[PDB]
Write an enzyme that holds these catalytic residues in place. Sequence first.
Site, PDB file in Angstrom:
ATOM      1  N   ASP A  93      -7.737  -7.998 -23.501  1.00  0.00           N
ATOM      2  CA  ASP A  93      -6.832  -8.176 -24.638  1.00  0.00           C
ATOM      3  C   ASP A  93      -6.145  -9.532 -24.518  1.00  0.00           C
ATOM      4  O   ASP A  93      -5.516  -9.818 -23.492  1.00  0.00           O
ATOM      5  CB  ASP A  93      -5.772  -7.071 -24.667  1.00  0.00           C
ATOM      6  CG  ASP A  93      -6.266  -5.768 -25.293  1.00  0.00           C
ATOM      7  OD1 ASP A  93      -7.367  -5.733 -25.879  1.00  0.00           O
ATOM      8  OD2 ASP A  93      -5.518  -4.766 -25.212  1.00  0.00           O
ATOM      9  N   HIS A 144      -7.419  -7.674 -32.334  1.00  0.00           N
ATOM     10  CA  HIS A 144      -6.286  -7.105 -31.596  1.00  0.00           C
ATOM     11  C   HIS A 144      -4.994  -7.124 -32.423  1.00  0.00           C
ATOM     12  O   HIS A 144      -3.907  -7.241 -31.863  1.00  0.00           O
ATOM     13  CB  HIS A 144      -6.104  -7.835 -30.260  1.00  0.00           C
ATOM     14  CG  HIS A 144      -5.263  -7.099 -29.262  1.00  0.00           C
ATOM     15  ND1 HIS A 144      -5.260  -5.725 -29.146  1.00  0.00           N
ATOM     16  CD2 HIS A 144      -4.419  -7.558 -28.306  1.00  0.00           C
ATOM     17  CE1 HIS A 144      -4.424  -5.368 -28.187  1.00  0.00           C
ATOM     18  NE2 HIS A 144      -3.915  -6.462 -27.652  1.00  0.00           N
ATOM     19  N   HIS A 148       0.646  -8.248 -32.803  1.00  0.00           N
ATOM     20  CA  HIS A 148       0.925  -7.252 -31.774  1.00  0.00           C
ATOM     21  C   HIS A 148       2.130  -6.362 -32.114  1.00  0.00           C
ATOM     22  O   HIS A 148       3.063  -6.238 -31.320  1.00  0.00           O
ATOM     23  CB  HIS A 148       1.135  -7.944 -30.433  1.00  0.00           C
ATOM     24  CG  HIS A 148       1.231  -7.017 -29.257  1.00  0.00           C
ATOM     25  ND1 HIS A 148       2.392  -6.351 -28.925  1.00  0.00           N
ATOM     26  CD2 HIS A 148       0.319  -6.672 -28.317  1.00  0.00           C
ATOM     27  CE1 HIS A 148       2.183  -5.618 -27.846  1.00  0.00           C
ATOM     28  NE2 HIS A 148       0.934  -5.795 -27.456  1.00  0.00           N
ATOM     29  N   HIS A 238      -6.167  -8.068 -19.083  1.00  0.00           N
ATOM     30  CA  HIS A 238      -5.595  -9.180 -19.832  1.00  0.00           C
ATOM     31  C   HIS A 238      -5.841 -10.455 -19.054  1.00  0.00           C
ATOM     32  O   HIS A 238      -6.201 -10.409 -17.875  1.00  0.00           O
ATOM     33  CB  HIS A 238      -4.086  -8.996 -20.056  1.00  0.00           C
ATOM     34  CG  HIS A 238      -3.726  -7.701 -20.704  1.00  0.00           C
ATOM     35  ND1 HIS A 238      -3.700  -6.515 -20.010  1.00  0.00           N
ATOM     36  CD2 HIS A 238      -3.385  -7.402 -21.980  1.00  0.00           C
ATOM     37  CE1 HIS A 238      -3.356  -5.535 -20.829  1.00  0.00           C
ATOM     38  NE2 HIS A 238      -3.158  -6.048 -22.030  1.00  0.00           N
TER      39      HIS A 238
END
Length: 273
Positions: A93, A144, A148, A238
């Site tokens: 991510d 994604h 966020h 990540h």
Amino acid sequence: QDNLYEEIQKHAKQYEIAPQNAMIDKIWKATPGYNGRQVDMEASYNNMKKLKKFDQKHLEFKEVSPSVHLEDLSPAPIYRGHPNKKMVGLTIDVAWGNEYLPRILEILKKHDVKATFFLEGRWVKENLRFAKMIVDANQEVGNHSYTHPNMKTLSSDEIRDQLQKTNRMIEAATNQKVRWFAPPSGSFRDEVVKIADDFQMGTIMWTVDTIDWKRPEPDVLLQRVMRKIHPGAIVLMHPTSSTTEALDTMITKLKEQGYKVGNITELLDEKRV
């Protein structure tokens, strides 16, 4: 007694595997199907006839498709590949961590392994060259969200806008079609999954969380993964120092355990490993 051809015939059923259908598991939700296999008599014979002895290592197979496929299922999140498929999927991510992306890409190249890079739309907009770096390394990208947010608490309009803006940004910056969406923090509700499906994206979760954003010691991360890994696992990472320091050894140890390692598109494929 039996010639080699008969010996291969006698062993055919022992190595046969029925195909497995896709289904929505009560716990793990949408799970792909997985090919079965049957002995290919001609190729197997040709592989063994020089040494004139049966050797299961030299069997070759024809694959058999399942009848129900991932795309037949009703919309639902995907946490895992098929539990009989000896493969692990890697997901990364990306909304920050530029300084670790080149090393991560080099480690993946060294192992000839792919990972799905789920890109935050605002990050792509602000870091076009790093988005391009990922796809120039022949890696696939996913969605994604744009900023966020917690998508479980967003209105349906906001969900649609987050997904659509991100796909427009990713496709302009990478020229790749987006197949997969990863919810920020794993937070979703049914409407998120359905809207993502309306954009022709599956919703991808995970089964093994490295929790690398907490900056664990690299060996602590490695041990966490190896303690939790399983056939069909999806690993969440990540671009962090912990992941970058652990990834080379992690892939080596996964392969040593007999896993193929790849991205989401590869993991969910019905083809056998």
